[PDB]
Subunit: 405 residues, 2 copies
């Protein structure tokens, strides 16, 4: 019989990556898997506009309920896409809605590896980008001269109801930005446990990255991480052979971390950072490793009941330049590994959360990865890695289908 897929959210996009995933689902998944449990959504930019973003709200509900989401690369309906695709209004990135809706802890941005193919980092690197806070949720104005004041009124504790001044300053420029944001740090306890748990299992040395020497409000990010590490993990990292006895958890300034990403070509490390530092440093990570497609973008949140909500995504876009070449009838070569890693992660997590056909699902997802890697080893991978004698998009997809059983 076919494998019974556990409940999972599937978010379809458009252009080259949707064409490729249509093929993968029809030729790899569907012959071997009953996908009745998959709740599919059309997140075309046109469909987000056509539905007034009801589809995005349905995605968020489904994700809370099901706990496991695969999302394809999607076209954010920016002002430029309104012009091109002929939309009625512009819509922001869906990332904010997912990160708030699923109580986001981290975006895991890990290097993707192929056994037998050398990429930039020799051994796995793990990266946690704190999923919330910082300038991504700032309030701001662009102003001239005047008086800026920031007040805070606690709602509990000894000084509940008493307003204090956080900051007061005089703007003396005709043009200035004024900006306020917050970092919520309660979930850094969860982040730390998630990060250090991962790093231990991977046997990689963990590092915490901030600008806390100068941006002193970040100190709790470090302190929370170090406390969890010392109390709950340090002896375990010693016993795993990862760190020497007496070796303390290392703090890296963001300034240093940017240098270490270029230097540490052997890999075998983990970093955790705030939202913006994570955004920047993981794109650097992508470039050093190979390209955006070879780093994960795995959002990890938590339901109110304590079950982890995991969404998985490739880190490249929809690849319109290649899609246009397809409709002109020219040969394409899209590497589907990024998206497949995400689908694997989503299918695996769905199987674990719901305990539906768990053994057979892990065996099948493992088999997909193994077959993919073996083809790359054999010189039958896509042209990004195997050169001009590498396979086209369709040849690669058919090659895997023939190998799968």
């Amino acid at each position: 019989s076919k494998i019974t897929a556990a409940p999972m959210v599937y978010v379809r996009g458009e252009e080259m990556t949707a064409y490729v995933m249509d093929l993968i689902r029809s030729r790899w998944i569907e012959p071997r898997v009953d996908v009745g449990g998959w709740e599919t959504f059309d997140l075309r930019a046109k469909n987000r506009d056509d539905t007034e973003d009801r589809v995005l709200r349905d995605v968020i509900e489904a994700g809370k309920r099901i706990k496991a989401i695969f999302k394809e690369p999607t076209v954010t309906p920016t002002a430029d896409q309104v012009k091109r695709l002929g939309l009625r209004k512009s819509w922001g990135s869906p990332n904010g809605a997912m990160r708030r809706g699923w109580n986001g802890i981290t975006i895991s941005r890990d290097t993707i590896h192929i056994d037998g193919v050398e990429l930039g980092y020799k051994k796995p690197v793990l990266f946690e980008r704190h999923a919330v806070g910082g300038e991504y949720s700032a309030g701001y104005k662009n102003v001239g001269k005047g008086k800026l004041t920031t007040t805070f009124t606690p709602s509990e504790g000894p000084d509940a109801g008493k307003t204090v001044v956080v900051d007061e300053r005089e703007i003396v420029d005709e043009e200035a930005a004024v900006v306020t944001y917050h970092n919520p740090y309660d979930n850094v306890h969860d982040l730390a446990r998630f990060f250090f748990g991962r790093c231990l299992e991977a046997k990689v040395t963990p590092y915490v990255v901030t600008k806390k020497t100068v941006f002193k409000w970040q100190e709790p990010f470090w302190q929370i991480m170090r406390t969890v590490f010392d109390e709950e993990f340090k002896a375990q990292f010693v016993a795993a052979g990862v760190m020497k006895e007496g070796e303390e958890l290392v703090h890296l300034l963001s300034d240093a971390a940017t240098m270490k990403l270029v230097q540490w070509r052997q890999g075998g490390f983990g970093m955790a950072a705030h939202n913006y530092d994570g955004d920047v440093l993981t794109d650097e990570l992508a470039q050093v490793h190979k390209s955006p497609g070879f780093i994960t973008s795995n959002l990890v949140g938590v339901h109110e009941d304590g079950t982890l909500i995991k969404e998985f995504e490739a880190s490249h876009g929809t690849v319109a330049d290649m899609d246009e070449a397809r409709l002109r009838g020219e040969e394409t070569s899209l590497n589907p590994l990024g998206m497949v890693e995400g689908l694997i992660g989503a299918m695996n997590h769905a199987a674990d959360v719901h305990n539906i056909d768990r053994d057979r699902t892990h065996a099948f997802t493992t088999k997909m990865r193994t077959v993919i890697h073996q083809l790359f080893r054999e010189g039958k991978g896509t042209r990004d890695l195997c050169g001009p004698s590498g396979l086209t998009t369709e040849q690669f997809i058919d090659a895997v289908a023939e190998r799968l059983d």
Copy 2:
């Protein structure tokens, strides 16, 4: 007849770098250049303490007057140095006082090259780090649950004197940072002119780097840059053959620029960014190129009279490990190029801003660089680049001196 040095501020530090520059002043500069106009200051940590920091104030006043400063690496008299150096008390970093005193608008962070020795970037790269604003001067608090409010009362325009809300948010975490900052943008006009002028002279393509797509308050950094470019430079870039007719100034997202720094190993570009982004990106630049010592750290400010105050530094410390080796009688090999590039920059600026012996100064500073590079090509540079067969600190210094004429 010696070259007449223009008025210049010389700030001496301590340890190995002061020892080296003492030899360079004695053996390269003084025999060939009348340094009567140099005002020299002793910025040993011990001397900041011994003068109750009058020496720092004297440096700042002289720099305002003279407009050209070379500063050696220095040891900030932190709490850690008090016991070690026998100080009465600790003293803060001088950098803020220098930046405010000299109306700093940018820290210029440029790659340093040796003709015939391959470093990371083949051709010069220029970087401007905006020297003001951002989280470096943020007000902040670490708080629990409560209401945060940011208001602004403009002092000009039709709504002058009326308070408006910039931001309002409810803090729902037991542990959170709340942060307010501003970006003064009036001086981006001056920064733009300086940046594009330098890029034109260098014949490199300029790029502006921000996160303005998400951090929308940054938009004016781009708008001011692009407006100055279009109105005052684009035609000249076309005339010089640096850019083609109809080629527009490019904006790079900060997380794209981190990838470009690894990718663009040919060099031959310039970037301008906000304070924090510059701080992080220029260290990445250091690591790609070679190490921090091969990138400049030159503060540039605008004098009230319209001319520029320029201060030049190397981006390494005082090299205490070599100083200790030196004092035990062991061989050393300090590469003085970073500091020499700084001194060259200061002497050239002094000659140019005061219009004193420009041709002879520029010829002499060019000669020092030409002699240095040739020695490295012969394998008679310092041991960092030339291996164990390279010259010692003193041998290298004497090798240059005998070739200067």
